[PDB]
C-alpha cells in the first residue's frame, strides 16, 4: 500500500465511494516534463523499491 509512511485522510470514505464504480479512465492531469520547468521532478526514495 503506502510504501512511504504516513496517514491516508478519509480512507474508508474512499473505499465507500469506490464500491459503486464501474470503470475508470486514467489520464494525465499535469505533464511531468512540461508543467514543472523550474523544479527537479526526479525524486526517488529507498522506502519504495522496484527491481532492486
Amino acid at each position: 500500500g503506502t510504501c512511504f509512511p504516513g496517514d491516508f485522510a478519509d480512507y474508508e470514505e474512499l473505499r465507500e465511494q469506490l464500491s459503486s464504480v464501474s470503470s475508470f479512465e486514467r489520464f494525465e492531469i499535469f505533464p511531468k516534463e512540461r508543467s514543472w520547468p523550474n523544479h527537479t521532478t526526479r525524486g526517488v526514495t529507498a522506502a519504495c523499491p522496484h527491481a532492486m
Partner: protein
C-alpha cells in the same frame, strides 16, 4: 464525507419496511382462511344440532 452513515440510515429504513409489510400480508392471509373455516364449522354445528 459521511456516505457510510447515509448508507447505514437507508439500510435501517429499508430493512424495517420489508419486515412490517411481510408481517401485514401474512396476518391478513392467515386470518382470511381462519374466517372461512369458522363459517363452515358453524354451518356444520347447525346441521348436527338439527340431526340430533
Amino acid at each position: 464525507l459521511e456516505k457510510r452513515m447515509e448508507n447505514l440510515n437507508k439500510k435501517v429504513d429499508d430493512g424495517f419496511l420489508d419486515i412490517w409489510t411481510y408481517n401485514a400480508e401474512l396476518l391478513v392471509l392467515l386470518e382470511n382462511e381462519r374466517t372461512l373455516d369458522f363459517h363452515d364449522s358453524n354451518v356444520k354445528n347447525l346441521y348436527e344440532k338439527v340431526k340430533n
